[PDB]
Design a binder for these strands. Structure first.
Ligand SMILES: *[C@@H]1O[C@H](CO)[C@@H](O[C@@H]2O[C@H](CO)[C@@H](O)[C@H](O)[C@H]2NC(C)=O)[C@H](O)[C@H]1NC(C)=O
Ligand SMILES: *[C@@H]1O[C@H](CO)[C@@H](O[C@@H]2O[C@H](CO)[C@@H](O)[C@H](O)[C@H]2NC(C)=O)[C@H](O)[C@H]1NC(C)=O
Ligand SMILES: *[C@@H]1O[C@H](CO)[C@@H](O[C@@H]2O[C@H](CO)[C@@H](O)[C@H](O)[C@H]2NC(C)=O)[C@H](O)[C@H]1NC(C)=O
Ligand SMILES: *[C@@H]1O[C@H](CO)[C@@H](O[C@@H]2O[C@H](CO)[C@@H](O)[C@H](O)[C@H]2NC(C)=O)[C@H](O)[C@H]1NC(C)=O
Ligand SMILES: *[C@@H]1O[C@H](CO)[C@@H](O)[C@H](O)[C@H]1NC(C)=O
Ligand SMILES: *[C@@H]1O[C@H](CO)[C@@H](O)[C@H](O)[C@H]1NC(C)=O
Ligand SMILES: [Mg+2]
Ligand SMILES: [Mg+2]
Ligand SMILES: [Mg+2]
Ligand SMILES: [Mg+2]
Lengths: 639, 639
DNA sequence: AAAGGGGGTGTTTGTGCGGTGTGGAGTGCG
DNA sequence: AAAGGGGGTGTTTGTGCGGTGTGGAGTGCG
């Protein structure tokens, strides 16, 4: 190898030092590209610009991907929130919101309005007033809109109102309207599990994650108007405004009118590839959402700029600096990401067989520059060692210190959530995924609104160029170290900590497990067997000669199957897309098993004996099968 | 390569010429090994003998596999079939059968007895007397017992009686009792989809294929006694005995008492491996059922003898003749095969992650010598070219002619059925599977009875040694050509015929498809795309250098994914184990789509519009995704 | 009979071929 | 207090360690 890690890192750094990220973001926030709603003309214009840029970079191949998806848009009739008397007579209009929640059911609901803090399950459980047959008003944040709506609907609430409170969203003007989607999932909600291509002819199907109650986003002024008609006083545990109130007066009601209409649109996914020199059929996917409801400077402008600049720099290094990737690099520009990563999920569903054990890592650039105080990572454990090594190399954009300051950062990593485009890659496809951001201690206030302009981003983050340079540096080092080395730099040994944590959590209910005719010895043995398999694999890697391309291919295939073997092989990928037992959603996951067992502990009566027994069996054998497959040949398994 | 195909074929032939198959079968039918019911002491003794033989052959590794499965056995109380009056009073006992149907519901049912020909759906549809609230009596054969019971149960019959008629089973004595199982599936019916290991702790689960009505096998004398109390005359279209009758007299009823009890038993799967010299992690599995209800000479003795002799010959060639397999060879001795390939299916479920894309072919030796007139093959299309090449080489055991006599043999190959141990490998695991037999035009009469002794086999098939030698020759040539060549000898191009046949069958309902807002252009394009992918792969194989181990590994992996890509990625592997869209069972298969569309054509009212639309979408995209994955890299797909 | 349709084969993938009235490769009939 | 239990850590996978009353690696208390 003419270029080693040090020389290639230096080349990446000197490419970054002469890159104008601020100019690219400013160009992406031009009037020719905003507003940039999914399937619009501006979205298609930016897709064509991205495609022409990928062609200008002289990538190995540039190709398009058209999907026809169903999304919700505002009707000609305006959604309205209205205070009505006990007899339904008009009192006074509250607000005709400018924003809306996509995939909210188009319906009119009237009833009492009661306040939940954030819509989390703890907020609903610890709430004095029962939320049934009543509209719940929740504050935006701490969970996705879909989670809030699902939690409210599971308690038989007839509607949801969402607003951004002053404390958590210190926006100066209270009339600002924002956008979200209430689909508890990813992709097109009307083509669950299948690619939504013309080939399917779009059969009548409907995802179970679609809400059945109206959902509406209202401005802070509208929320204060509603609180003016309420009585209860919010608890101090909710660090919210003093104007916030709990329950509507007994002589008033709220009529929520939602009339969003489904629209079928064409979304483009733009791809470019830098084909590898040793193993081109294996690749790292680098993706960034392109669409945005408003201007989307931080929502999609920063990610698209990072994608374009990374593609340019990597093409320059491969073509001019002599960089020779062993694997390929795919640069993906997703569309319809504001509706739940629709483009990425439909691409994953369309090409699942082609991406199976070929794409071994997804890097998400969405909202990578969102602030400057903290560097936050949510990723698969396989990427923890790579992230730690990158953090020890990349300096902080503002302070001269390296990003690696906390030795225990890995124990504070948040699980990937539905709002992240890396979640479909990890939980559904079993491809290790990483999402990182430079963020503050608080959520970005303008994210998802009409004030998410480039001017606001450059005002909130002066020296945005350096922060974007640092984000592109960590992403480029990810790509280089995942693609140039003879080893994949995926740490299968990091799942030993995950299994230990699961065993420790499950040991809290040993009395409950002993009350049933069950035992934890099989899960203990599975944890030990997985550790032994990882140690065997590390010994094999150490013994193998690096120049021997065959044995290293075998070992790298064993490493690539690690994340796939944690997808549940017992649930329907159509009904339960997120089959990952660690990071997926559904009763097949380990957290669901722990939740069911905790329900048994509380003696609430909602515990399901048979469901828990099946969960324990399937989880135990999923872990044991992952260990067995990682160990080696079928005859080498101990039992 | 010191040894080429000709020299190695000659070595195999000269090893076979000095092999005593008759002696091995006679030894396996000794009193120390019969009767050999699953989980019994004789079954364990034969498992230990097989393990000691594998160790004596000096195979690379010999290992065991213990499963604890639930099977049905006869109670202390005898099952009885009784003729009763209209008031339920005893008339006279018909028979206390010596055999039974495993997994039949233990219940007592009384009602009218009506005759269906074989229990096939056509037999029930074309039957004058409605079979509801009545016991149906069917002839054994032409479909599995489970299929008969499911067909009867779907029409609300309260019980099933099975007998072997004189015409189809020319057994001299009419008192012979036989055995079967009524589980519409494979594996342990009480651990559906999961390995049934101690790790699962055996949660409360139940397969949907278990019948809910009593099922009993009765002797021919008992059936004639029952027909003596019947009135109707069977149609001449049923080529059955003249004694057969249709419907019970109006003044008589049949009381069927079944009291089978579940028993948990330990079954052993004995394995031996001959590790390859180039790609040991990939292997061909050669399997044979060991257990049998009776003596099981043809049911399990012949297959086990063939397995032992093949293992001996291949170990001798690898150790003494210099044969150097590129891949490995696994010799598997399954147990509990009489209950629906329980051992093989539980092994597949236990090690699904380890066998995934590692086992690329399963060869089934069960009932390979069952006669001498015909050579019958049921296999995956990927193995059709290998089977044809083997047939052109192997001479017929009796006549000097080669096995390949009919040029159109491939169009007459029967689909693998539930009674075959290769069916779980093909339909569930996506591993190409082959089952062959030397059989007559009629079913083996003693198969599954207490007269399936070695004496009957040697009387019915004189020169059994030569027929067993020919069966071992075709199996050994299968193993050699699948394992020695640098190419896998799997013909992906044979699925072009399957897709053409599917398109031709679907073209019969173009008017019905046009009546709905549907089109077949996507399936036509999928067929063409799959052909283009296969042609591209053949061109790549021709261009690639054989000595280049890396590119050939890549191409062979592309070939190995072919059968796996035809498993439906949209159904639950637990609820629908047989996910193969061609050879599986369920609404996800292409035959199910055709059946639904035919239901639309008949205007019966049972057609499901939404189900058919989803079926068409999912089948179209399964075929298109298989084509896309076979074509190559994701960027090389045309659209 | 005459102008246009559905139903048709089966390797050169072919899904076309609707305009001519049989024929691309294979092939009908109102 | 004394003999035996459930609950406990967290790399040397550790699932053990129940008999001693704290300790394997880490570590309580009736
Ligand atoms: C694929 O399906 C989409 C719709 O799902 C088709 O697009 C529509 O085409 C009709 C007729 O041309 C137009 O009236 C609609 O406005 C289109 N919808 C959109 C969202 O553009 C498309 O034509 C289909 N493609 C193919 C090749 O059949
Ligand atoms: C507990 O979970 C089991 C599933 O493990 C539920 O049983 C299922 O019930 C549905 C109908 O509601 C059936 O279609 C399934 O076949 C059942 N599965 C099994 C394995 O029994 C059961 O209903 C749950 N209990 C409660 C109280 O919700
Ligand atoms: C695995 O489970 C089986 C039963 O499913 C256990 O075997 C039973 O063990 C009990 C107690 O030793 C005996 O009374 C039964 O007769 C056994 N059943 C059979 C069919 O043999 C077995 O002990 C379990 N293995 C482990 C290691 O726990
Ligand atoms: C036709 O098939 C559909 C499935 O494609 C059936 O609809 C399902 O009905 C069950 C309850 O019976 C629900 O749990 C499923 O969610 C439904 N699925 C869908 C996609 O709708 C439908 O019932 C069938 N029709 C008939 C008459 O049997
Ligand atoms: C909520 O449930 C309680 C208990 O059944 C019921 O009394 C109450 O009326 C319900 N709420 C509404 C708005 O009906
Ligand atoms: C079978 O169904 C028909 C139609 O409902 C009914 O009349 C008849 O009684 C049923 N058979 C029995 C044995 O009840
Ligand atoms: Mg036509
Ligand atoms: Mg012609
Ligand atoms: Mg303990
Ligand atoms: Mg210590």
């Amino acid at each position: 190898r003419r270029l080693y890690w040090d020389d290639l890192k230096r080349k990446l750094s000197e490419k970054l030092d002469s890159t104008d990220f601020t100019g690219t973001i400013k160009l992406l926030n031009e009037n020719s590209y905003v507003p940039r709603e999914a399937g619009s003309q501006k979205d298609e214009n930016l897709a064509l610009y991205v495609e022409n840029q990928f062609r200008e970079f002289k990538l190995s191949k540039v190709w398009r991907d058209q999907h026809f998806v169903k999304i919700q848009v505002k009707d000609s009739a305006q959604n309205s929130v209205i205070i009505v008397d006990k007899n339904g007579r008009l009192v006074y209009l509250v607000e005709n919101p400018g924003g809306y929640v996509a995939y909210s059911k188009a319906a009119t609901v009237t009833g009492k309005l009661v306040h939940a803090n954030f819509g989390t399950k703890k907020d609903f459980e610890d709430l004095y007033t029962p939320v049934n047959g009543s509209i719940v008003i929740v504050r935006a944040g701490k969970i996705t809109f879909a989670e809030k709506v699902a939690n409210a609907e599971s308690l038989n609430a007839i509607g949801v109102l969402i607003y951004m409170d002053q404390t958590k969203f210190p926006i100066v003007n209270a009339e600002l309207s924002f956008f979200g989607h209430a689909h508890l999932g990813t992709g097109d909600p009307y083509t669950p599990g299948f690619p939504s291509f013309n080939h399917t002819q779009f059969p009548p199907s409907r995802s179970s994650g679609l809400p059945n109650i109206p959902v509406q986003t209202i401005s802070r002024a509208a929320a204060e108007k509603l609180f003016g008609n309420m009585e209860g006083d919010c608890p101090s545990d909710w660090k919210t405004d003093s104007t916030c109130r709990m329950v509507t007066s007994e002589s008033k009601n709220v009529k929520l009118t939602v009339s969003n209409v489904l629209k079928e649109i064409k979304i483009l996914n733009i791809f470019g590839v830098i084909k590898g020199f040793v193993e081109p059929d294996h690749y790292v996917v680098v993706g960034a959402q392109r669409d945005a409801w408003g201007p989307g400077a931080a929502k999609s402008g920063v990610g698209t700029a990072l994608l374009l600049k990374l593609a340019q720099m990597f093409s320059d290094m491969v073509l001019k600096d002599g960089f020779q990737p062993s694997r390929s690099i795919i640069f993906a520009s997703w569309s319809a990401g504001d509706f739940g990563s629709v483009g990425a999920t439909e691409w994953l569903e369309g090409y699942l067989s082609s991406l199976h054990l070929k794409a071994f890592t997804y890097i998400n650039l969405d909202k990578a520059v969102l602030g400057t105080s903290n560097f936050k990572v949510s990723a698969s454990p396989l990427l923890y060692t790579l992230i730690e090594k990158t953090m020890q190399n990349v300096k902080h954009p503002v302070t001269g210190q390296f990003l690696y300051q906390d030795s225990n950062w890995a124990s504070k990593v948040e699980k990937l959530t539905l709002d992240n485009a890396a979640f479909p890659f990890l939980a559904y496809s079993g491809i290790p995924a990483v999402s990182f951001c430079f963020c503050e201690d608080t959520d970005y206030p303008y994210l998802g609104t009409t004030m998410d302009t480039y001017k606001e981003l450059i005002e909130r983050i002066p020296e945005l160029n350096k922060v974007a340079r640092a984000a592109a540096e960590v992403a480029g080092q990810f790509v280089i170290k995942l693609t140039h080395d003879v080893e994949l730099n995926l740490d299968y040994e990091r799942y030993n900590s995950q299994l230990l944590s699961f065993v420790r959590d499950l040991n809290q209910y040993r009395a409950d497990i002993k009350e049933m005719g069950l035992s934890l010895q099989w899960l203990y043995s599975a944890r030990g067997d997985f550790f032994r398999a990882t140690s065997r694999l590390t010994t094999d890697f150490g013994n193998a000669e690096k120049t021997d391309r065959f044995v290293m291919k075998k070992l790298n295939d064993r490493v690539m199957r690690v994340e796939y073997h944690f997808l549940s092989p017992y649930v329907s990928p159509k009904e339960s897309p997120f089959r990952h037992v660690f990071w997926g959603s559904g009763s097949h996951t380990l957290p669901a098993l722990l939740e069911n067992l905790k329900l048994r502990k509380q003696n609430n009566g909602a515990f399901n004996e048979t469901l828990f027994r099946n969960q324990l069996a399937l989880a135990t054998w999923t872990i044991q099968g992952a260990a067995n497959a990682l160990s080696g040949d079928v005859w080498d398994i101990d039992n």
